[PDB]
Design an enzyme around this catalytic site. Sequence first.
Site, PDB file in Angstrom:
ATOM      1  N   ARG A 193      24.710  14.863 -33.630  1.00 38.94           N
ATOM      2  CA  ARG A 193      24.538  13.857 -34.648  1.00 38.94           C
ATOM      3  C   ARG A 193      25.614  12.779 -34.481  1.00 38.94           C
ATOM      4  O   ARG A 193      25.326  11.592 -34.634  1.00 38.94           O
ATOM      5  CB  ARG A 193      24.647  14.455 -36.083  1.00 38.94           C
ATOM      6  CG  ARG A 193      24.210  13.354 -37.060  1.00 38.94           C
ATOM      7  CD  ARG A 193      23.964  13.485 -38.577  1.00 38.94           C
ATOM      8  NE  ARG A 193      25.162  13.697 -39.328  1.00 38.94           N
ATOM      9  CZ  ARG A 193      25.481  13.083 -40.468  1.00 38.94           C
ATOM     10  NH1 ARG A 193      24.750  12.113 -41.012  1.00 38.94           N
ATOM     11  NH2 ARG A 193      26.624  13.476 -41.047  1.00 38.94           N
TER      12      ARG A 193
ATOM     13  N   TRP B 135      15.554  22.285 -40.647  1.00 40.96           N
ATOM     14  CA  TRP B 135      14.207  21.924 -40.214  1.00 40.96           C
ATOM     15  C   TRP B 135      13.546  23.140 -39.631  1.00 40.96           C
ATOM     16  O   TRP B 135      12.321  23.243 -39.503  1.00 40.96           O
ATOM     17  CB  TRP B 135      14.195  20.822 -39.123  1.00 40.96           C
ATOM     18  CG  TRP B 135      14.729  19.500 -39.682  1.00 40.96           C
ATOM     19  CD1 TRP B 135      13.881  18.612 -40.290  1.00 40.96           C
ATOM     20  CD2 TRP B 135      16.047  19.079 -39.729  1.00 40.96           C
ATOM     21  NE1 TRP B 135      14.636  17.644 -40.754  1.00 40.96           N
ATOM     22  CE2 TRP B 135      15.932  17.870 -40.429  1.00 40.96           C
ATOM     23  CE3 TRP B 135      17.285  19.490 -39.258  1.00 40.96           C
ATOM     24  CZ2 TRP B 135      17.045  17.061 -40.656  1.00 40.96           C
ATOM     25  CZ3 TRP B 135      18.385  18.682 -39.489  1.00 40.96           C
ATOM     26  CH2 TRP B 135      18.276  17.487 -40.174  1.00 40.96           C
TER      27      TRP B 135
ATOM     28  N   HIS C  34      24.948   8.693 -34.045  1.00 44.47           N
ATOM     29  CA  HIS C  34      25.498   7.692 -34.953  1.00 44.47           C
ATOM     30  C   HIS C  34      26.456   6.604 -34.401  1.00 44.47           C
ATOM     31  O   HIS C  34      26.542   5.496 -34.971  1.00 44.47           O
ATOM     32  CB  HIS C  34      26.232   8.359 -36.079  1.00 44.47           C
ATOM     33  CG  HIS C  34      25.374   8.808 -37.252  1.00 44.47           C
ATOM     34  ND1 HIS C  34      25.658   8.687 -38.540  1.00 44.47           N
ATOM     35  CD2 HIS C  34      24.157   9.413 -37.160  1.00 44.47           C
ATOM     36  CE1 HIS C  34      24.679   9.182 -39.233  1.00 44.47           C
ATOM     37  NE2 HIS C  34      23.783   9.614 -38.388  1.00 44.47           N
TER      38      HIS C  34
HETATM   39  C1  HEM Z   1      15.135   7.586 -38.824  1.00 43.93           C
HETATM   40  C2  HEM Z   1      15.994   8.531 -38.161  1.00 43.93           C
HETATM   41  C3  HEM Z   1      16.907   9.437 -38.726  1.00 43.93           C
HETATM   42  C4  HEM Z   1      17.302   9.661 -40.038  1.00 43.93           C
HETATM   43  C5  HEM Z   1      16.851   9.019 -41.347  1.00 43.93           C
HETATM   44  C6  HEM Z   1      18.150  10.769 -39.969  1.00 43.93           C
HETATM   45  C7  HEM Z   1      18.771  11.347 -41.082  1.00 43.93           C
HETATM   46  C8  HEM Z   1      19.527  12.517 -41.124  1.00 43.93           C
HETATM   47  C9  HEM Z   1      20.084  13.074 -42.268  1.00 43.93           C
HETATM   48  C10 HEM Z   1      19.925  12.584 -43.714  1.00 43.93           C
HETATM   49  C11 HEM Z   1      20.779  14.216 -41.815  1.00 43.93           C
HETATM   50  C12 HEM Z   1      21.642  15.217 -42.593  1.00 43.93           C
HETATM   51  C13 HEM Z   1      23.087  14.862 -42.771  1.00 43.93           C
HETATM   52  C14 HEM Z   1      23.889  15.925 -43.537  1.00 43.93           C
HETATM   53  O1  HEM Z   1      23.680  16.115 -44.737  1.00 43.93           O
HETATM   54  O2  HEM Z   1      24.758  16.588 -42.969  1.00 43.93           O
HETATM   55  C15 HEM Z   1      20.541  14.280 -40.453  1.00 43.93           C
HETATM   56  C16 HEM Z   1      21.061  15.264 -39.622  1.00 43.93           C
HETATM   57  C17 HEM Z   1      20.992  15.396 -38.227  1.00 43.93           C
HETATM   58  N1  HEM Z   1      20.434  14.503 -37.441  1.00 43.93           N
HETATM   59 FE1  HEM Z   1      19.204  12.977 -38.109  1.00 43.93          FE
HETATM   60  N2  HEM Z   1      18.255  11.246 -38.733  1.00 43.93           N
HETATM   61  C18 HEM Z   1      17.601  10.379 -37.960  1.00 43.93           C
HETATM   62  C19 HEM Z   1      17.616  10.416 -36.568  1.00 43.93           C
HETATM   63  C20 HEM Z   1      18.261  11.327 -35.722  1.00 43.93           C
HETATM   64  C21 HEM Z   1      18.280  11.231 -34.332  1.00 43.93           C
HETATM   65  C22 HEM Z   1      17.642  10.097 -33.489  1.00 43.93           C
HETATM   66  C23 HEM Z   1      19.086  12.315 -33.932  1.00 43.93           C
HETATM   67  C24 HEM Z   1      19.503  12.771 -32.671  1.00 43.93           C
HETATM   68  C25 HEM Z   1      19.022  12.388 -31.378  1.00 43.93           C
HETATM   69  C26 HEM Z   1      19.421  13.008 -35.086  1.00 43.93           C
HETATM   70  C27 HEM Z   1      20.138  14.216 -35.098  1.00 43.93           C
HETATM   71  C28 HEM Z   1      20.575  14.940 -36.191  1.00 43.93           C
HETATM   72  C29 HEM Z   1      21.177  16.181 -36.141  1.00 43.93           C
HETATM   73  C30 HEM Z   1      21.350  17.097 -34.926  1.00 43.93           C
HETATM   74  C31 HEM Z   1      21.463  16.466 -37.481  1.00 43.93           C
HETATM   75  C32 HEM Z   1      22.090  17.743 -38.028  1.00 43.93           C
HETATM   76  C33 HEM Z   1      23.595  17.630 -38.189  1.00 43.93           C
HETATM   77  C34 HEM Z   1      24.267  18.808 -38.852  1.00 43.93           C
HETATM   78  O3  HEM Z   1      23.774  19.931 -38.765  1.00 43.93           O
HETATM   79  O4  HEM Z   1      25.311  18.602 -39.462  1.00 43.93           O
HETATM   80  N3  HEM Z   1      18.955  12.393 -36.171  1.00 43.93           N
HETATM   81  N4  HEM Z   1      19.789  13.253 -40.041  1.00 43.93           N
END
Ligand code: HEM
Length: 291
Positions: free
Chosen positions: A45, A188, A49
């Site tokens: 993540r 997920w 970002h």
């Molecule tokens: C429109 C696109 C996206 C949105 C709105 C989005 C939003 C989010 C949100 C709200 C979280 C949770 C944050 C938390 O509470 O810790 C999250 C987690 C995460 N995102 Fe996405 N995301 C997007 C795209 C992506 C993409 C493109 C990647 C990676 C190639 C990605 C990888 C991850 C990963 C691995 C997590 C989990 C992190 C953890 O376990 O702490 N996301 N995302």
Amino acid sequence: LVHVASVEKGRSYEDFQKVYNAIALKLREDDEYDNYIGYGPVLVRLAWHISGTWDKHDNTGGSYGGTYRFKKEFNDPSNAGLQNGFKFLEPIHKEFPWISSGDLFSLGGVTAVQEMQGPKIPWRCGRVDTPEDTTPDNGRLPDADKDAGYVRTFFQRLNMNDREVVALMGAGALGKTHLKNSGYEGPWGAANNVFTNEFYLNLLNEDWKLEKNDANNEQWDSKSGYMMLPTDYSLIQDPKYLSIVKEYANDQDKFFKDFSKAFEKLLENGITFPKDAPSPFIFKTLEEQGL
Ligand code: HEM
């Protein structure tokens, strides 16, 4: 802006492979984090970002300048929770003081994916740290409460087309949302620190129910204890995204191949590479090295 990639003076493939091995050994050792999910998900993540702030129209943001180290980007609301990934990597940056920030932040994501049984991601070195005044303003990362039209449009600023957006989104197999960071709560999928096409099989096979959570935000909840964000659920509402979702749910190898190509492109946007530059590096895993 032009941002030409400059190799850290004197370093070759073997130097970077040592930085990879250091990150991977510490992923293995600090396995207790976030209820034994480990640091790998917050590290892919973080790499997305620092890259996703890019704007294709004026070449500002993106991974090149390592600007997340600066206060304005570090304290961005949309970056809440990534400070744990930063603190994980900070001992590694004191061990290899010659690596630039943008190269360390981006190589953390590559190492995380490969060590979690994912595809090999070719990586290129040469990001150069840029000053505090090149730090992008807050507000360029995506919202979760929106639809497939928002998503298509958002990703066009990073010139990602439909296939690259659905491949990238499948990183959702890893990790989970956390209420105190984003106002959303839950994983997920079940195997959330092994890289698989699980995100697609859950989106197509579960009986999702729209509900509000304790932060008053909506999310799609299933009986199995899984969740999907409004922007994730969009991928089956749109006809063009839905056919790509089905393709990855029936063929994890096509998903690994497309995720690989799209994630490198995401990490390389806004960076010009001279052709005297080294070819992209394919790093060996601990396991391939016997370590
Ligand atoms: C429109 C696109 C996206 C949105 C709105 C989005 C939003 C989010 C949100 C709200 C979280 C949770 C944050 C938390 O509470 O810790 C999250 C987690 C995460 N995102 Fe996405 N995301 C997007 C795209 C992506 C993409 C493109 C990647 C990676 C190639 C990605 C990888 C991850 C990963 C691995 C997590 C989990 C992190 C953890 O376990 O702490 N996301 N995302």
